[PDB]
Structure formats: C-alpha cells, structure tokens
C-alpha cells in the first residue's frame, strides 16, 4: 500500500482549496468541498501534517491546541 504520488499532490491542493476558501483551516478544507481528493486515506491525513513540517504546508487545526494558563 505504498506508491501515492497523488497524495503529496493533493495535500497541496486542499491547502490551497482552503487558501481559496479563505483560511488555511482543517475545517477550511471541509468547506471547501468538493475538493481534489482522489482517495480518502487515513494516510493521508497523518501524511499531511507530515508535509506540514517538513515539506511546510501551511494549514491550521482551528484547535487552540496552544494553550497555558485559559487566559487568552
């Protein structure tokens, strides 16, 4: 289950479709359906925050997974 040249593809194209969209959202991205995808993949959802930091794929959670003290 390897060999997915589509998939580096596609997770800048939803980048992009939210970027379209408006923001560089998960959510964003949800909206922006429908969107590029070839394939559903639980793959490709570890695959794009991978390409996120290596690659640099700019895109939010929306989650405030930033977070301290619930002051801000």
Do not use: C, W
């Amino acid at each position: 289950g390897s060999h997915m040249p589509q998939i580096e593809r596609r997770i800048k194209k939803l980048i992009s479709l939210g970027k379209k969209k408006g923001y560089i959202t998960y959510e964003d991205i949800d909206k922006a359906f429908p969107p590029d995808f070839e394939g559903f993949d639980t793959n490709l959802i570890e695959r794009i925050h991978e390409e996120l930091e290596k690659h640099g794929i700019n895109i939010v959670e929306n989650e405030p997974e930033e977070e301290e003290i619930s002051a801000g």
